[PDB]
């Protein structure tokens, strides 16, 4: 319903289904009449602009992004809440000066700036003025105004999986690309987070992301793969680690477990060769049992199992 056409449809008492935009809402909106749609903060800025002079308003900000922007900062930090910063303020300043750094034991890995429709940023982009034009020419965006810091104890594949789960739930189901591709990408991400992925899965995810980005009807589907694209571009290494091993951050493996699948386990050897803890003690010829008591979740069993059954 944040989409303009869907917003108008919902205001009329119907399903919030967006429609193609030959008739933009500015010319024909509610019941075909011209409708002006704006955000809350734009309407808030209006009175401030009129009360002041134009130049007096432009005193703060940037030439292309004058004024300020109210942000909401979450994640582990000494102080999290609503903040207002003049356009052009770097993310490092917001995260370390206004928010006062991270709580003890928490570090910086990435920061999301626009939720599902936003993008992932790393330490390289932390020191960079916040402007619509700059972020557009930085492979990112200012976003709606929501900021969440990501620490080193959380997994970015999990972040992309979470955002795709949200998008899959929220898709209106009108056009094929968003409706089906978001679910398929979510399934691929589930496979990644469960150690069932492959390089072919990564290729499928990339091409599917491009297809969803280009062929979606409205902005929800168009920006649906944004977390996938950004997180891939910045943590291909984490993706590879999930493909050929375990979670580098343990987030996926911290609250998970390894179980020998007796259905397709014929009790061959191996397993014990790598396991330092010898948490196998299986019955030869019959399916093997992984001893959860002394399982450090190293993930070496899955790394080498010709009959892949380390679930």
């Amino acid at each position: 319903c944040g989409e303009e056409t869907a917003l108008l449809a919902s205001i009329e008492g119907k399903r919030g289904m967006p429609r193609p935009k030959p008739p933009f809402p500015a010319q024909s909106g509610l019941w075909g009449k011209p409708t002006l749609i704006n955000n809350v903060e734009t309407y808030a800025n209006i009175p401030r602009i009129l009360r002041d002079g134009v130049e007096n308003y432009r005193k703060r900000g940037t030439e292309n992004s004058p004024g300020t922007k109210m942000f909401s900062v979450a994640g582990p930090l000494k102080a999290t809440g609503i903040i207002e910063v003049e356009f052009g303020t770097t993310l490092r300043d917001i995260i370390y000066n206004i928010c006062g750094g991270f709580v003890e034991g928490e570090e910086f890995k990435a920061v999301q700036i626009g939720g599902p429709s936003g993008a992932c940023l790393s330490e390289d982009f932390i020191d960079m003025p916040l402007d619509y034009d700059t972020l557009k020419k930085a492979d990112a965006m200012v976003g709606s105004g929501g900021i969440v810091v990501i620490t080193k104890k959380t997994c970015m594949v999990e972040v992309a999986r979470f955002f795709l789960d949200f998008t899959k739930r929220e898709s209106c189901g009108k056009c094929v690309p968003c409706r089906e591709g978001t679910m398929q990408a979510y399934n691929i991400l589930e496979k990644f987070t469960h150690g069932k992925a492959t390089y072919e899965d990564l290729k499928t995810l990339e091409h599917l992301s491009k297809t969803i980005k280009t062929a979606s009807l409205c902005g929800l589907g168009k920006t649906a793969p944004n977390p996938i694209l950004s997180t891939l571009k910045l943590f291909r290494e984490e993706y590879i680690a999930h493909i050929e091993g375990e979670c580098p951050s343990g987030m996926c493996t911290a609250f998970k477990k390894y179980v020998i699948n007796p259905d397709i386990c014929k009790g061959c050897g191996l397993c014990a060769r790598s396991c330092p803890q010898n948490a196998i003690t299986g019955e030869r010829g019959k399916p093997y049992t992984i001893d959860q008591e002394k399982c450090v979740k190293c993930g070496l069993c899955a790394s080498k199992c010709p009959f892949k059954a380390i679930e």
Binding site: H207, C268, G269, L270, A272, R273, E283, R284, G285, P306
Partner: protein
């Protein structure tokens, strides 16, 4: 002979084999699932039921006699036919969207016409086989056990690699021991696929690789086979069309191909090289008779069957590989681009060319081979009216070719091209051609000086055995694995019967007719390629010549008791023959199994079983590290294992 069908007078024919064929000749159709291809027989479907004198019987095995009253449609026959069709469909893998026979399947059309909408019978499970190791893909879950593929592979191709196995509900057409088709003696001619009426036998589709390559930054280069242009027009329901290759070039350039060439240029180059090789062989009178190597199916068949004739095979590689090597090794340098930057796409009518492109001797030359059907799918995806497409010529310098080069697409093409090359280099006084059989032709050729030879053209594998056994009066033999040559290849549009193959040959002949230059030497680009690139014999051999190696099965296939998938181990094998079983062998096996049950936590030990090791009368035999022990017992195998 006049008969009565449903109560009306009908005149069928004077002499007929059965009622079904006679009525079909008249124009009265009886539903049936036996007549499915040229290699079809009657008696299995049981759907041709008719009523005569009260009792129902099959019309395919009923001799028509004068004054016979036959009712072809009664409620009992409707019930029986629908029951039979439901039985077929109950266990059939009903996924037509991903099937290769979608839209051209008789079973699908019957399911539509019979209004079958629910399966009253259980979709019972079978031990189905899914073989995707070769360009020919097998999926027995769509098999209706018509047996056409078996007859095609045995009676027509002479290989006999696929046969009926088991019986009853488990009846399946498969290879021996469910061996992957890639590892059998299969020549990958694709004739079983061409005759298969369902999706059980299909060609491996590689369109996704082509699309991902076109989307990439590599330079995609395509080359079309002579027989591809003579048959592609069938897929669109249109008649013959010369200039089909040029509009195909237009379409390929439209979809993003940087360069499109003609494999006929490669055919002319191969013919030139083969003509000179054959002349040297004649003047030295050695390594005769010579065999053409243009057909990869024939090459693989010779490797499997004639290891002694592998030296008699032409060293020259096929037009596809010759032109692809020329491209990758010469055109890339002429364009100043690394060989990794070029993606070579081959549009062929053959399923064995997919195998040839993946051969260890041709690695990395041809990236993907697409059959004629796959090219038709490419055209159909775009939805452009290929008929309305404006033709344009092939790209240079490998776009032009001589009539002889384009003749490669049908049986007798390479031999004719070689004859033209020889005639131009050294005239031919006269050629006398005989026709010993349907698919065998022998030519008597005399050169100007006086040295004469006999060359034979054989199309259709399986005719080679008798000719090679009884005829030794030839010096050069052209072998094409498919009837009519490449116009009837495995990758050609379906149906692929003999009438369509003859029409394709006629279309290719008409296309040849409009070619001005008649012999390879008249091809100026080809002479240029020799002049600036293949001047010396070293590069010519490294570019246009290949080697052949014998093929023999290497099956161990010994009993697996406690196998180890991989890793350093001991691989102890226990003989299980009757002689060894007579005292201790099985009991020793039990001891070892229990030993690895209590010991051998890891895959250090692989308790394995093997058949007689030709060491009988020498006590039970147990193999250790591929070593013979004799007098084996648990303690001895233990100490040897130590």
């Amino acid at each position: 002979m006049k008969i009565y069908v449903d109560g009306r007078e009908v005149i069928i024919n004077d002499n007929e084999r059965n009622l079904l064929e006679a009525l079909k000749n008249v124009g009265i159709e009886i539903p049936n699932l036996c007549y499915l291809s040229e290699a079809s027989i009657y008696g299995a479907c049981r759907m041709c039921l008719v009523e005569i004198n009260g009792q129902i019987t099959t019309s395919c095995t009923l001799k028509p006699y004068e004054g016979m009253k036959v009712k072809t449609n009664t409620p009992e026959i409707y019930e029986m036919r629908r029951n039979i069709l439901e039985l077929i469909l109950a266990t059939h893998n009903r996924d037509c969207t991903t099937c290769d026979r979608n839209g051209s399947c008789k079973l699908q059309k019957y399911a539509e016409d019979f209004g079958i909408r629910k399966i009253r019978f259980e979709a019972l499970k079978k031990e189905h086989v899914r073989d995707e190791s070769a360009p020919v893909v097998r999926d027995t879950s769509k098999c209706i056990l018509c047996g056409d593929c078996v007859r095609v592979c045995e009676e027509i191709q002479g290989v006999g690699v696929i046969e009926f196995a088991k019986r009853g509900f488990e009846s399946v057409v498969t290879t021996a021991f469910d061996t992957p088709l890639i590892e059998t003696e299969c020549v990958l001619c694709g004739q079983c696929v061409a005759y298969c009426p369902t999706g059980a036998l299909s060609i491996r589709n590689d369109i996704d690789k082509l699309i991902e390559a076109l989307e990439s930054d590599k330079i995609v280069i395509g080359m079309i086979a002579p027989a591809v242009r003579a048959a592609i027009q069938e897929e669109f329901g249109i008649d013959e069309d010369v200039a089909m290759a040029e509009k195909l070039v237009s379409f390929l350039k439209t979809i993003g191909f940087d360069k499109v060439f003609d494999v006929s240029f490669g055919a002319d180059l191969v013919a030139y090289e083969e003509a000179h090789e054959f002349y040297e062989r004649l003047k030295k009178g050695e390594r005769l008779p010579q065999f053409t190597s243009c057909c990869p199916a024939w090459v693989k068949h010779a490797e499997h069957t004639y290891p002694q004739y592998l030296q008699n095979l032409s060293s020259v590689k096929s037009p596809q590989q010759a032109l692809g090597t020329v491209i990758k090794k010469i055109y890339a340098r002429k364009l100043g681009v690394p060989e990794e930057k070029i993606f070579l796409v081959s549009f062929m009518p053959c399923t064995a060319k997919k195998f040839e492109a993946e051969r260890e001797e041709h690695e990395g030359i041809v990236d993907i081979v697409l059959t004629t059907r796959e090219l038709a799918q490419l055209i159909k995806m775009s939805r452009i009216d290929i008929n309305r497409v404006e033709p344009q010529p092939f790209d240079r310098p490998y776009g032009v070719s001589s009539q002889a080069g384009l003749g490669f697409g049908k049986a007798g093409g390479v031999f004719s091209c070689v004859l033209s090359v020889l005639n131009e280099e050294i005239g031919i006084e006269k050629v006398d051609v005989k026709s010993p059989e349907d698919g065998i032709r022998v030519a008597e050729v005399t050169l100007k000086d006086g040295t004469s030879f006999k060359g034979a053209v054989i199309y259709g594998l399986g005719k080679v055995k008798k000719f090679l056994e009884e005829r030794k009066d030839v010096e050069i033999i052209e072998v094409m694995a498919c009837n009519y040559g490449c116009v009837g290849g495995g990758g050609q549009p379906y149906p692929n019967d003999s009438r369509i193959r003859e029409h394709r040959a006629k279309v290719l002949r008409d296309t040849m007719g409009i070619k001005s230059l008649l012999t390879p030497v008249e091809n100026l680009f080809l002479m240029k390629l020799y002049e600036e690139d293949l001047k010396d014999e070293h590069t010519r051999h490294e570019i246009l010549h290949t080697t052949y190696r014998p093929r023999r099965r290497y099956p161990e296939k010994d009993v697996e008791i406690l196998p180890v998938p991989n890793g350093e181990k001991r691989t102890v094998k226990v003989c299980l023959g009757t002689s060894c079983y007579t005292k201790g062998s099985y009991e020793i096996l039990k001891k070892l199994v229990d030993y690895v049950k209590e010991n051998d936590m890891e895959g250090k030990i692989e308790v394995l079983g093997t058949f007689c090791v030709e060491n009988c009368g020498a006590s039970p035999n147990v193999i250790v590290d591929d070593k013979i022990i004799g007098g084996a017992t648990f303690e001895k195998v233990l100490e040897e294992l130590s």
